[PDB]
């Protein structure tokens, strides 16, 4: 397979960055492609073997080296704002099959100043009672608004486990102010669950948002908290709000239990009294 | 040398057979790859056509090559909404030169699931704490219906997305619109796009049934032990009450 790191990256204009790509199948051919939205896919430097290198079609602003066939690094000595794009690493064998293996991809952003970046704010909205009354289905929607850049990953967790069924996520974020750039992004995701499962109080639903941002070595001098790479999450408990559930059962049985030992101590004390009179009469 | 795909976009209902063509200006090639991207998340390929091979089949995917005619075709049988992705066509030169692939512009495909029981409706989600926004949901609309952006900048409307629920094998379409300021009663929010007149608008009055809630009841071990504690306490209570009554009778005698 092909592995490239990192997934996301934020850079300041003038900084330097190096991208790592590695393969474990002794592929002779390695390549890098950058993809820009809606005009085409382009090629960067490539190597067909250790120790050689031919320039790509956009060779300016990117730098590579081939010392070992198992690793292929891409380096940006000076970051320019125009270099914001999505990068892919490709590897292949020579002649035998002609197959191509594509990396998971890397997203990079270069900004003039780092003061513009912001961490996302996550909110989750519970389903309407009308929907569960009509279609007998409950829909959960999670909103992730006002962040910059869009280096965001969203996932749903139920009872401490990630779920990949019944979940929809908007493939493209929506800008708060589309008139001008830059602007903060909004994202929404939908999760639908059968009404019986949603209305269980034990079921805990969690919306997780993973944000890739500044590193510890990044200088920060703004009057707000440093937007380090972090994870923001929203929690929610299952509920019904019309009828009897286990939570009402638990408190009811516990109050019943409590009442039973005052009644028991009541009964034992009375029994002690009458029996004490009885054995006194017996002994006397 | 160059790769051209025809068409660039396609929209079809589910279950239809699809024909996709790729073109190249040079027949002196040894490779053929078909990739899948949706929308990024890397490129996935399940196909391989060699210069010595005429037809390749894998799963529900057919492929053919005609080097003399300079044509390449991809066949999809019983198209499903899971096939909605961007499809790429790649070639590599036959000569032992630079081995540079020449990817095409790419083809986009969207497959509309066939809804069996349409039921358009607009529901309002209760506002969560620490948030000043209001959200309403329009869902279970037929695939021929389709939404558009709002007429004001303070109202945000998302595009429609398809949902798959494996537990109930159900497919559905829904859209979400939210706004922050003023009078955002979603009886008027979905306005720029025409919606069917039979779309359900529920009343603000809420109603539900305890019978449906009872179906979700469940049991735990600690609750069971507490219940047995209850039963035990009742047993000792009856026993001590019987003895107490007996003592009252004896002492009153």
């Amino acid at each position: 397979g092909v592995t490239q790191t990192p997934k996301f990256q934020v850079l300041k204009t003038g900084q330097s960055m190096t991208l790592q790509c590695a393969q474990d199948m002794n592929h002779e051919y390695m390549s890098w492609y950058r993809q820009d939205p809606g005009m085409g896919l382009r090629l960067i430097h490539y190597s067909v073997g250790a120790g050689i290198t031919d320039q790509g079609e956009v060779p300016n602003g990117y730098n590579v080296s081939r010392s070992t066939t198992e690793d292929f690094p891409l380096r940006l000595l000076s970051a320019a704002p125009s270099q914001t794009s999505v990068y892919f690493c490709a590897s292949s064998y020579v002649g035998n099959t002609g197959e191509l293996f594509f990396g998971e991809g890397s997203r990079l952003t270069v900004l003039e100043d780092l003061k513009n970046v912001f961490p996302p704010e996550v909110a989750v909205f519970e389903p309407s009672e009308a929907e569960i009354s009509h279609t007998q289905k409950a829909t959960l929607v999670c909103l992730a608004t006002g962040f910059y850049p869009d280096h965001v990953e969203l996932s749903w967790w139920v009872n401490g486990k990630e779920v990949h069924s019944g979940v929809s996520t908007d493939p493209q974020p929506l800008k708060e102010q589309p008139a001008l750039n830059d602007s903060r992004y909004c994202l929404s995701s939908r999760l639908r669950v059968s009404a019986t499962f949603w209305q269980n109080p034990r079921n805990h639903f969690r919306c997780q948002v993973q944000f890739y941002g500044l590193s510890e070595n990044d200088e920060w001098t703004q009057d707000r908290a440093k937007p380090v790479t972090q994870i923001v999450s929203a929690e929610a408990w299952g509920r019904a709000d019309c009828g009897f559930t286990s939570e009402s059962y638990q408190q009811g049985v516990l109050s019943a239990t409590i009442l039973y030992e005052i009644l028991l101590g009541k009964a034992t004390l009375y029994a002690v009294l009458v029996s004490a009179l009885v054995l006194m009469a017996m002994v006397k | 040398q160059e790769v051209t795909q025809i068409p660039a976009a396609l929209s079809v209902p589910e279950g239809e057979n699809l024909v996709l063509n790729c073109s190249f200006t040079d027949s002196a090639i040894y490779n053929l790859q078909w990739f899948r991207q949706d929308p990024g998340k890397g490129l996935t390929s399940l196909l391989l056509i060699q210069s010595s091979q005429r037809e390749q089949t894998s799963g529900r995917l057919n492929a053919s090559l005609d080097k003399s005619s300079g044509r390449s075709t991809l066949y999809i049988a019983a198209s499903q909404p899971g096939d909605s992705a961007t499809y790429l066509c790649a070639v590599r030169p036959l000569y032992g030169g630079s081995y540079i692939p020449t990817f095409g512009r790419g083809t986009s495909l969207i497959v509309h699931p066939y809804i069996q029981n349409p039921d358009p409706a607009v529901y309002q989600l209760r506002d969560s704490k620490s948030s000043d926004k209001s959200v309403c949901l329009f869902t279970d609309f037929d695939s021929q219906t389709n939404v558009s952006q709002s007429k004001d900048s303070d109202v945000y409307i998302t595009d429609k997305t398809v949902l798959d629920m494996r537990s109930m094998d159900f497919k559905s379409n829904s859209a979400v619109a939210w706004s922050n300021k003023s009078d955002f009663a979603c009886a008027n929010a979905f306005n720029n796009s025409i919606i069917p007149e039979d779309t359900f608008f529920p009343s603000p009055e809420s109603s539900c049934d305890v019978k449906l809630v009872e179906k979700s009841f469940e049991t735990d071990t600690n609750l069971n032990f507490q219940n047995l504690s209850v039963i035990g306490f009742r047993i000792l209570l009856l026993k001590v009450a019987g003895f107490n009554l007996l003592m009252t009778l004896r002492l009153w005698s």
């Binding site: 009897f244 059962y249 009811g252 049985v253 019943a256 | 009554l245 009778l249 009153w252 005698s253």
Partner: peptide
């Protein structure tokens, strides 16, 4: 469910104590 259970329990208890008073006072 449980609360109604205990209400029936209490109702039978008061019925029982009243009837016990009844035959206790009638006999001796």
């Amino acid at each position: 469910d449980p609360k109604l259970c205990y209400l029936l329990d209490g109702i039978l208890f008061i019925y029982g104590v009243i009837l016990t008073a009844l035959f206790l006072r009638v006999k001796f």
